[PDB]
Design a protein around this ligand. Structure first.
Ligand SMILES: CCCCCCCCCCCCCCCCCC(=O)OC[C@H](CO)OC(=O)CCCCCCCCCCCCCCCCC
Ligand SMILES: CCCCCCCCCCCCCCCCCC(=O)OC[C@H](CO)OC(=O)CCCCCCCCCCCCCCCCC
Ligand SMILES: CCCCCCCCCCCCCCCCCC(=O)OC[C@H](CO)OC(=O)CCCCCCCCCCCCCCCCC
Ligand SMILES: CCCCCCCCCCCCCCCCCC(=O)OC[C@H](CO)OC(=O)CCCCCCCCCCCCCCCCC
Ligand code: NI
Lengths: 106, 103, 103, 103, 103, 106
């Protein structure tokens, strides 16, 4: 079972600033990582697939990068609607697994 | 048209069909097995092709029994198909040589 | 029946026999060698098939001398058998073409 | 000269051409994909050869879609070319045997 | 004896010769290259065989230019030799079928 | 993204002495490392390619070695014109990346 480590758990940033969420896999998994956003009382939302690919309907400020065991979800000019929980998920080996999540805080 | 040609096409149609079924079946068989990688169709399709051609990159391979069974079918179809084409090329070459030799 | 067909079957019977003996022999030869993986029959059987077909996944291979010797026998049987089938397909295709050409 | 011979040469010229185009295309397609290794022409040329011959070492392989598409073309050209030579050798061998049998 | 048979033997003698020269040359070419593994004759001999047969295990492969050049020669000899045998089997099968068909 | 770690960041040596710069990759990359020299106000200069290969026009005192994850750039009889910044670069996997550099000091 691939282990995805998200750290720090909580992230604090000032409005407008660029922020970077981190996800490290217990083993090389290519670019088979994906990001989801979950706001309070809401369900998960695919933000980035296969590490970097963007999803239509998702603000262009959201971008991702990395490969192997290190991945980063980044967000330019952070704004209040960006306040929620982030999670990573790998599809490299069965079974799929999730990160422990990271809370964004402005 | 002629027979060996018809059989070559037949080999190609079937090969494509086996590669596709091959991808579906591989995934269905591999998901559920901890540590398995043959678990998404796109790459499973690419694994199929590698296998049929025997180019064997080693970046993907089954780890479950049905997966390997599926694998065998793909390998044989690949080998058989490409071999049947080689024979088709030989027959064509033998026939023409007969003509060119006024036989 | 005809000769090449009979020989194809013969090739298949032998191939199966060599794959099986191949699995047994591989394990007998590999166990005892620190770091070896070809040490349980089920996978050794699957290693055999990979080898005969030359699909070479690279997830399993011998590391001892007899293991590699066994490996060679399997590779040759695999290559020879599949090649003998290709020839069988060519002969069949050549013969029919003779008929279809009223020769 | 004869046809199968001419076709063999043709197969060799094309194979070389596909290996070269293969190297260029592989690199063009792989660069830009994080983690990719098929990114310098020299090794991409060596990857090509491995692939065409299906010797599959597994030290280099594409990870992007066009890369794999390119890969398929190389594999088929390699398999087809080497198979067309095998047929060429068969025709030559069949023709001479006809002579030696005063047919 | 006949021609294709004589040529098959010839293919085998040469193949063995190329495998041996192949081992020597591989080592001579690989030693000196940091990180290289094709550096002792015994395994280099086993690498040769893998390569000629294209079974491609991926446990050993060249990393220097001459090593890869040597590798190519081995791959081609392996492919050519095994292909020339396949043709030999086809000719034999075609000739007998002619007899059995009272032609 | 392969990470190249150059350490120490600053190196102090006595005229004429032999010096060794270090570069470690976050993963095995063969010998696909290359060295560049950059003096104050100047641009980078290829010093060694593929770990060991020398470059014409480059003082014979410059040599490199290593493979996999450890690499070393060495310079015999260090002299004042050798005072500048060193950097390593890998071409094993996309994208190419650079070391954080090492300053030579006599
Ligand atoms: C000739 C065959 C070439 C196969 C290339 C596969 C590349 C996979 C990839 O790296 O593609 C990468 C790409 C994402 O970057 O995936 C995609 O969306 C692209 C879609 C690719 C293929 C279609 C899906 C596979 C269908 C197999 C049959 C399933 C039946 C059910
Ligand atoms: C066509 C050949 C397909 C071989 C698939 C092997 C899968 C091994 C496995 O992942 O199988 C997995 C499975 C356990 O999950 O093993 C088992 O029990 C299943 C038994 C499988 C095969 C029989 C044992 C090998 C016999 C070889 C000859 C030995 C002569 C002595
Ligand atoms: C038969 C083919 C043998 C290929 C051996 C490649 C070895 C690569 C290497 O380890 O070579 C090592 C060597 C550096 O040590 O690289 C070099 O300079 C040597 C140059 C080698 C090959 C020419 C470049 C590739 C051209 C492919 C087509 C591109 C079209 C654009
Ligand atoms: C059919 C070919 C089978 C090759 C098996 C090689 C096993 C190597 C090994 O794991 O063998 C292991 C064994 C030590 O445990 O090595 C030894 O002493 C055994 C000697 C083996 C082979 C002779 C040496 C190679 C000669 C190649 C040509 C060189 C020309 C110069
Ligand atoms: Ni006749």
């Amino acid at each position: 079972d691939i282990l995805l480590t998200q750290s720090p758990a909580i992230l604090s940033v000032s409005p407008g600033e660029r922020v970077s969420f981190s996800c490290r896999a217990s083993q090389s998994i290519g670019t088979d990582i994906h990001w989801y956003q979950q706001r309070t009382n809401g369900s998960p939302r695919l933000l980035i697939k296969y590490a970097s690919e963007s999803i239509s309907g998702i603000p262009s400020r959201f971008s991702g990068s990395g490969s192997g065991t290190d991945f980063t979800l980044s967000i330019n000019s952070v704004e209040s609607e960006d306040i929620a929980n982030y999670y990573c998920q790998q599809s490299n080996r069965w079974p799929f697994t999730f990160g422990s999540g990271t809370k964004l805080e402005i | 048209s002629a027979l060996h040609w018809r059989a070559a096409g037949a080999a190609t149609v079937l090969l494509v069909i086996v590669l596709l079924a091959g991808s579906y079946l591989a995934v269905l068989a591999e998901r559920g097995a901890p540590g398995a990688q043959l678990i998404t169709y796109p790459r499973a399709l690419w694994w199929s092709v590698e296998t049929a051609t025997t180019v064997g990159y080693g970046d993907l391979y089954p780890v479950t029994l049905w997966g390997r069974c599926v694998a065998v079918v793909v390998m044989v179809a690949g080998i058989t198909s490409f071999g049947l084409v080689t024979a088709a090329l030989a027959t064509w070459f033998v026939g023409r040589e007969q003509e060119r030799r006024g036989h």
